[PDB]
Symmetry: C3
Subunit: 301 residues, 3 copies
């Protein structure tokens, strides 16, 4: 066996039976102590017949399927570090809890044999990232790990066009589910083309041929936020450009800039930002569950 | 066997016998419906005793050695998509035709056991690419695929010095055949040093030791355009700087900029641009055929 | 056996016995013809019970443990090329001597089974590197080669914050030995956080779990220069900003800029620059020897 991995009975049975599983990250389970969200998300994933697998680090182990005991700790403990792939080693050595990010979670999901992962938005090239080189580790982790990541594109505070250019340079396939424009998190679209897939069985056959030809690597399937739930591009951009405008005059750069952009976004959105992010989270999870079903059936032939 | 790959009898026999083969891309076979070019190119490759292998996608298959029927379609069909490595999966799933680029073709060539690929110019860092991050997927595909790519350096509309810096960061060997300056497509030189190889058997022994030590990865062998056939650096640069000058005042960026640079180049060159690109294509193909012969003999010891 | 590698008896015995070995680069053995330095360095490494393995290229071979004859040549021959990983193939084919850099040496160390490498400073993103793309091949070589590199961070003429951002994007773990700020070569600190490891056995268990989960790749363990021996950040920066100020007015960019920065540094430091670099070299080598001992013991369980 594997001495680092602890996989729940349900997930281990689904994998043994080549049934559909969808991985979920823990780094944000922390952002909703309720849980109510995790419950709508599990429901969205199972509605397709997929098994949800929430992932994190605890006790020197990579945990696939957190126990209720564990979800409780992740919900209620103050000090929990966010763990990208490069932090996994130290999180294991330390023996405490670690809430894994996109890059951290997909490496653990892949190690267990899970092939689909979902979240509302991935990391990317930050705004002014062509100058500061502040770019999420998710983008190059997608050159190594065999995974389909289903999301609503990059998070809104990031630079959508630069992230799309970087993924193209990195050779990472970017598909749009029923669209040929890149999803822009709580904003419907960025003016960036992607390859339209109208059907998830076609997307799954494309992903499978991608792995067979190019080897282990991530396929990004973007699915935009429901049009009824979108935030106005103008509102998002003006709020962000102003938040950056205050950054220059108060002279803040570095890891300080990014959490200001996040708070400025909450503010401009009435109080709708959480509501829009939840809608995107739910619809993306549904698509991930349906995609994972369609991939199990493709790999079955 | 392999269920994705269709290899012609001639190429399959040369490979079985460890005889020299040189891959060619289809994405540009489309740019010369004649054929006359493809015919001079085949002649240049065979003159060294190498077998030319033109590659593309058709009918759910990776095709190595296009049939006359297929070359005809690629010559005469309007809608044919250009396929980089990240597009291979969807091109296969779709079952139509796909004309593969440098990155797309070398992955298929490698899968068949071909080790040498040639084209007039590779992709690279685009001009202003330090700011726009518009950089060809070819450069990072060279970190994965075992191949020697023989070209006249990067295409002229690209930024030669930035492409050379990026390849150095990527650990991709860059050799100059009988020169210690980087080839600049239809321009003889960029002011960028490369490692001179005066002899192709020495270059082949260097490539082989590179693969043995560093693993699968591409070696770039650059061979400049004949001095009688070069375009004046000043002519190229002035034309490009002006084409960019019009871009700023008419406010065009994105994937719009690049095809303007290409047309501005045709214009400044009298009508010699096609003539110079063909000469570079022919001399590079000859060097590729001779290199491929010298590598088969090296691997034979 | 391996036909490219020549490993001395002492190193081959330590490896066979899974005892601690630390690799050293030759590219700088050239920078101190004395030797006296190499002798203090060997002493610092052995004090921990590790075996020092100096590496280079000679006679068509990758040499692990240079002979006295070889150290003499590297000390006394004028023309010796510096060999990064991408130059290994041509250095072998040429049959002459080659002094390997960080990237070149760790690939050879890994091939022999050595897992720890040390040097005073690694390459990184050069100053203005966000615009010139001048970035050391060491940073992406760390995505491929299984190694712990122990250093005092990046060399002082480089951009510390950009190098740290680039390593984060590349997924390369960056630990600080008893510190949570990045080491800045002869300067104690850059204002850049790293993950503190207070104990080398914990660092070794983190590195081992990193390799087990993320596969072959480099772990960077940074150890700052003794506070008694540091150069004043202000002195370093003012000297560098002025050296760059003269570069703009005398219009020098390219590979010309970097050796000016190096000479301007010698000048501002009284004559202490060599003295500070030697102290950093000695203390980093000690930490490398102790780390390598602690890793052999971890891998023994
Ligand atoms: Ca960052
Ligand atoms: Ca692009
Ligand atoms: Ca810039
Ligand atoms: Ca460089
Ligand atoms: Cl794009
Ligand atoms: Cl260069
Ligand atoms: Cl950082």
């Amino acid at each position: 066996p594997d001495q680092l991995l602890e996989v729940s009975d349900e997930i281990a049975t689904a994998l043994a039976e080549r049934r559909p599983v969808v991985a979920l990250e823990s780094s944000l389970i922390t952002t909703d102590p309720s849980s109510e969200t995790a419950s709508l998300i599990e429901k969205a994933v199972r509605g397709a017949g997929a098994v949800p697998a929430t992932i994190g680090i605890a006790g020197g182990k990579l945990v696939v399927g957190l126990t209720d005991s564990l979800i409780e700790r992740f919900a209620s403990t103050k000090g929990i570090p966010k763990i990208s792939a490069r932090d996994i080693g130290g999180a294991l050595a330390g023996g405490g809890l670690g809430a894994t990010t996109v890059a951290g979670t997909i490496v653990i999901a892949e190690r267990a044999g899970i092939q689909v992962f979902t979240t509302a938005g991935i990391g990317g090239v930050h705004r002014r990232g062509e100058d500061t080189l502040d770019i999420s580790p998710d983008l190059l982790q997608f050159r190594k790990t065999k995974m389909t990541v289903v999301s609503g594109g990059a998070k809104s505070i990031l630079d959508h066009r630069l992230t799309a250019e970087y993924l193209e340079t990195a050779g990472v396939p970017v598909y749009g589910y029923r669209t040929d424009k890149l999803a822009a998190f709580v904003v419907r679209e960025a003016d960036v083309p992607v390859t339209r897939m109208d059907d998830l069985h076609t997307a799954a056959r494309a992903a499978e041929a991608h792995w067979q030809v190019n080897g282990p690597g991530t396929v990004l399937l973007t699915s935009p936020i429901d049009e009824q739930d979108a935030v106005d591009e103008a509102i998002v951009e003006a709020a962000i450009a102003e938040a950056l405008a205050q950054c220059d005059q108060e002279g803040i750069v570095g890891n300080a800039v990014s959490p200001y952009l996040m708070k400025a976004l909450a503010r401009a959105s009435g109080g709708m930002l959480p509501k829009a992010g939840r809608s995107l989270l739910l619809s993306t999870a549904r698509v991930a569950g349906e995609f994972s079903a369609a991939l199990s059936a493709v790999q079955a032939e």
